[PDB]
Amino acid sequence: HMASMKKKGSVVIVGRINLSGDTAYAQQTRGEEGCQETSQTGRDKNQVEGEVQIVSTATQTFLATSINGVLWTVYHGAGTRTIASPKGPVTQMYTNVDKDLVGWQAPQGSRSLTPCTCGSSDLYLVTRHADVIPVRRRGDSRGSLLSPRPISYLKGSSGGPLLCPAGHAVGIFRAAVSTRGVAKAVAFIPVESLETTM
Ligand SMILES: COc1ccc2nc(C)c(O[C@@H]3C[C@H]4C(=O)N[C@]5(C(=O)NS(=O)(=O)C6(C)CC6)C[C@H]5/C=C\CCCCC[C@H](NC(=O)OC5(C)CCC5)C(=O)N4C3)nc2c1
Ligand SMILES: [Zn+2]
C-alpha cells in the first residue's frame, strides 16, 4: 500500500583503510547498531579521514574512494542510495549503471587521491583488509594479480582503488575474474572514465 512504502537507507561510512604511514591497516569507526541507525536517519556526525572508506548498507559492505573531491564507489553496492552526512542524506552527483559507477561529493575531512598520469602498468590494489596487492595492468580496464588468491580475499573490496607506484589513482575496483574460485585478474573503472563522467 502507498501508506506503508518503505524508503531504502543511506550508505554509511563504517571505517577506513589507513594509508597514512608505513603500515596499511583497516580501522572501524562505527559498529553495526550505530550503522543501522545512521542508515535510517542519514545523519552521520562522525569525523571522516583519509582516502579509502569502508561503507555499508543494511545488506552489503564494500569500499569507497575519494578522487578529485568525489567519493566514488560501485553501483552494484550502492545502487541509487544517498550517503549519510552530518546534515542528513546526500544525493549522488554521479550515477552510471553502464560503468558500475556512482559518486557523491567527498565528505568534509576526507583526502582525495590524485588521478594518475604516469602511464605505468605496475599497479597496487588496496583491499578492505588493508592488503596491498600488486597487479600488472593488462588493458584499459583489466589487470592480473601477480599472486592469485581465492576470490574470498577480494570480496567486499569493490570501490577500492588501484594505485600506481607513486600512489596516484588509476581506477576503481569493480569485478574479479576467477578460475575455479581463484582470482587471477581484476576489472576496474579507469580513472579516465571517472574524469569523463565528471
Ligand atoms: C546491479 O547493477 C549493476 C551495474 C553494473 C555491474 N557491473 C559488474 C561488473 C557487476 O558484477 C557483479 C558484482 C561484482 C563483484 O562481485 N565485485 C567485487 C566485490 O567485492 N563486490 S562486493 O563489495 O562484495 C558487493 C557485492 C558490493 C557488496 C570485486 C568482487 C570480489 C569478489 C568476486 C566475487 C564473485 C563475483 C565475480 C564477478 N566477476 C565478474 O563479473 O567478472 C566479469 C564477468 C565482469 C567483467 C569480468 C564480480 O566481481 N561481480 C559480479 N555487477 C553490476 C551490477
Ligand atoms: Zn601515477
Numbering used by the authors: 982 to 1179
Task: Provide the publication's sentences verbatim.
The NS3/4A protease is an excellent target for developing DAAs against HCV, and protease inhibitors have been a key component of most combination therapies. This essential protease cleaves the HCV polyprotein into functional units necessary for viral replication and maturation. Structurally Asp168 is a critical residue that contributes to an active-site electrostatic network necessary for efficient inhibitor binding. We rationally designed HCV protease inhibitors that retain potency while fitting within the substrate envelope to avoid resistance, particularly against D168A, which confers high-level resistance to current HCV PIs.
All of the P4 inhibitors were also tested against the D168A RAS and except for P4-2 performed better than the parent compound and grazoprevir (both ∼50 nM), ranging in potency from 2 to 36 nM. The cyclobutyl ring of P4-2 is actually slightly elevated out of the pocket, similar to the structure of the parent compound, and does not have the conformational flexibility to contour the enzyme. This lack of flexibility results in an unsatisfied or “frustrated” pocket that is neither filled by the inhibitor nor has space for water to easily occupy. This pocket was further destabilized in the D168A variant.
